[PDB]
Amino acid sequence: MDYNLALDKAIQKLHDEGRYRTFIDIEREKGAFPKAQWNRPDGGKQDITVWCGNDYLGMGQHPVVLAAMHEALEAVGAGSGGTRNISGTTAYHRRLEAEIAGLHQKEAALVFSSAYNANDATLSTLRVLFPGLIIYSDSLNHASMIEGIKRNAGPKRIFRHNDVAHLRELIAADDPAAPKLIAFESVYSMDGDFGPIKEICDIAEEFGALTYIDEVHAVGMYGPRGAGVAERDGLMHRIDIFNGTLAKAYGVFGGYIAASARMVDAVRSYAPGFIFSTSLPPAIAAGAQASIAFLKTAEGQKLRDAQQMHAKVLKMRLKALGMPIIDHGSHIVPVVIGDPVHTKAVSDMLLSDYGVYVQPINFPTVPRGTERLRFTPSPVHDLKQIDGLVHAMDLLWA
Amino acid sequence: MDYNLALDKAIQKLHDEGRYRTFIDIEREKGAFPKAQWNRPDGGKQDITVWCGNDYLGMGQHPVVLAAMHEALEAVGAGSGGTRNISGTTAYHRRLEAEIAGLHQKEAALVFSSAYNANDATLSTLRVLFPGLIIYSDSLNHASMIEGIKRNAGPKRIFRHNDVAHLRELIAADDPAAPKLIAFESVYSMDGDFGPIKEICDIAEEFGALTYIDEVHAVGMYGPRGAGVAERDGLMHRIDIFNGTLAKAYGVFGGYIAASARMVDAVRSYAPGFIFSTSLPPAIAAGAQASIAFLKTAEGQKLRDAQQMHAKVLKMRLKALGMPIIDHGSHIVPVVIGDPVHTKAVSDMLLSDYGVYVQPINFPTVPRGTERLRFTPSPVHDLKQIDGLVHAMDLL
C-alpha cells in the first residue's frame, strides 16, 4: 500500500468532480461590517463586501456583545480550563443555559462546543436512552443531524424533503410500540425554505413520536423574541427538543439543545460528546448570553425587521434582472448556477472585479447539479451596497 | 411509547452506581490563578484553590494571550460568522495553523472546534480515505478516539494498554496488504503514564502502518519547544499524524491535527465534522497562536521546568504521608480511592473544609474500581500552596 498514492487519488477525485474547495482568507472590519479585508493569494490586500456570511444580524460587532466578552476575559481569563465535570462549569455557562431555556420556554438547556456537536451527540445518545428508537429524518437534514442519526447503529427512515405524506406512510408502516423521533429543520440552509412544523407536530402527536427541530438558521431571526419559526407560528410547546447555534445570528460561537430537565440531565449524563470535551470559554458564553438577551428586546426586533426588509429588496432586484433566484420567503437568497466549475468562475469574478464575496457552494453542501451562490443580506447591508451588488451581477451576465 | 419513564430509568441507574456527577460552579480569578470563587449550591461565595484544572501552565491568564484576544475582538469581532468554506477562513486561523505545523515540524495543520472533534473526524474520515483500514487502538485511548474509530463501520483491534507485544501479535495476524493505522497517546490523562512511542513507531515501520498520536496532555509541556513527548524523545519525524488541543497547557480552546499537506488537505476535504461547523472565533485563534508561540521560547521553558518541579515536590510529599499515589513520572498526580462514593466524600470534604477543589473522577472517565482524585500542579501552585495541600490531605 502507498498511503500517499491513495491520498492523491482522493484529492484528484475532487478536482475531477469540480468540487475542490479554495478558501478565501478574510478579516472582517469590526464596526464596519459587512466590510472586510481580503488577503489575496498574491500577498495583496483588498477591501471587499461580505455577502455570504452567517453573522446574519451583525451581532459579531455589537458593542454589548463585545463589552461582555472583554469583561469576562478580564474577570476569569481565556478559557474554562476543564470539561463541565472537571472545573469547566462556570456561572457564565449556566447563566447562558438559563437564557437559552427561557428563549425556547423550556425547563433546561445544554451548551456544546457547536450546534454540530449538539446534533451529533444528542441524536446518537437518544438511541441509547430509548432502546429501539426509530428516527425519521428529512432528506435534506444538515450533515450534523445525518451523522448523529447514523452514528450508533439503529433504524432510520428518510422522508422526501418537506413531504409530510411520505412521513406518514413511513411511520404508519413501523411497529407502533417502538419509540419514535422525527428530526427536521425550521429553515433549510441552502434552499432557504421552511419545514412544515405544524404538520409534523400533528403527525408526531398522532403516532406518539418525539419532535426534534434544528432552528440553527432561525434563532435570533424569527419570532417576536428571536426564538425561531416555532415561536413565530406559536408552536414551541409542541416541540420536544430544540437545537440551535450561538454562532450565526447570535454572532458568537457554540451551540445547544433545549428541552425538559429530564431530557437535558440524561443527555448531559450519557453523551460522550458533552462529557469528554473542554467547556466553551467563559468569554464566548458571556457574549452569546448578551446576544440572546439583546435579541429578545424590541431593539432586537428592529434588526429582524431590517433583515427581512433587505432580503425582500434584494430578491425583488434580482428577479428584476431575470436571474435564477429561488424564493421561499426567508432571509436566505440562493442563486442556482447548477455547475460547480461555472459557480466558482462567477464567484471568482465577483470577488476580484467588484469586491463582492459570495463563496461558490457545491457538493456535499448541496446536491450535485444544484451548485449555487448564497446571499445573506443583513441589517448592515444597506440600500447602497445592495445597489453595489446588483450592478456587478448585471455587468457580469453580459 | 412512554418517554419520561425511560428517562427516569437512565438517570436512576447513575445514582445506583454512585457515578452521578454533581458539577461545581467556579470562577477563576484572572491574574491570581489558581485562586477561584466557588459558587456554592446554597448561594454563598467562597475562595478556593483549583487543584484539578487542565490550564496546566497558567496560560489562561497570561498577558500575551489576553492581549492578543482583546486585540482580535476589536479588529474583527466576536466570531468568524461562518464555516471555513463560507466566510469563516481568516488570517488568524491560517497563522494559527502555520504555528502548529511549525510546532510539530509538519507541512500542514488543521484546526477544529476541539481536540475531541479533531480525533473523531480524523479517525473516522481516514477509514473513507483508506478503504479497508484496520485501526489498532490502545485499550485506554481517550473517548474521542474510541468514538472516531467506531463511528464508521470497519476493522478495529484493541491492544492491552502500553502492551507492544500484544500490538505485534494483533498486527502480524492481519492481512499484510490491508492499510493499517496505530492510534495511541503520549501521556494518558488519568494514570499519568507515557505511551511507548519508539516501540510503536518500530512496529509501524516494520508492518507499513500509519502512526496517530494524541499529545493532548503533553503539548506545551514536553520537549524543548513544548511540541510534546515525541519532541522530547526526538521522534516527531516518525509520527504520521499529531492530534493536540489548544484548551489545556495552551490555555485557550480548540484542537487540531498536524500531518503532511496531502493528509491535511484530504481530511479537510472529506470530514463532515470539519466542513459543516462554524470556524473558531478569531479571538480564540489569536490567543492560542500567542500561547504556542510563547511556549516555544526559553521563557516558556521556564514554565515547564517549574511545572515538573512542582509535580515532583507534590509526589514526594504525598508519598511521605503514606498515600495511594501512582507515579509514572509525569505532571499528573493521581490518588486512587477505588470507590465512586468514597471518592466524592473525600472531594466534598476537601472543598468545604479546606478550600481545595479536586473533582472526584469516576466511570466512564476511568475504569470502575479505579475512581480517583487527580491533582494537576502548575507553575502557579507555589511551594506555599503545595505545602497547604499536603497538610490538608494529612489531617484527612
Ligand SMILES: Cc1ncc(COP(=O)(O)O)c(CNCC(=O)O)c1O
Ligand atoms: C487524551 C485526550 N484527548 C483529547 C481530549 C479532547 O480535548 P478537547 O478539550 O480539546 O475537546 C481530552 C479531554 N479529556 C478531558 C480531560 O482531560 O479530563 C483528552 O484527555
Ligand SMILES: Cc1ncc(COP(=O)(O)O)c(CNCC(=O)O)c1O
Ligand atoms: C442546519 C444547520 N445545523 C447545524 C449547523 C452547525 O452549526 P454550528 O456552526 O454552530 O456547529 C449548521 C452549520 N452549517 C453552516 C451553513 O450551512 O451555512 C447548519 O447549517
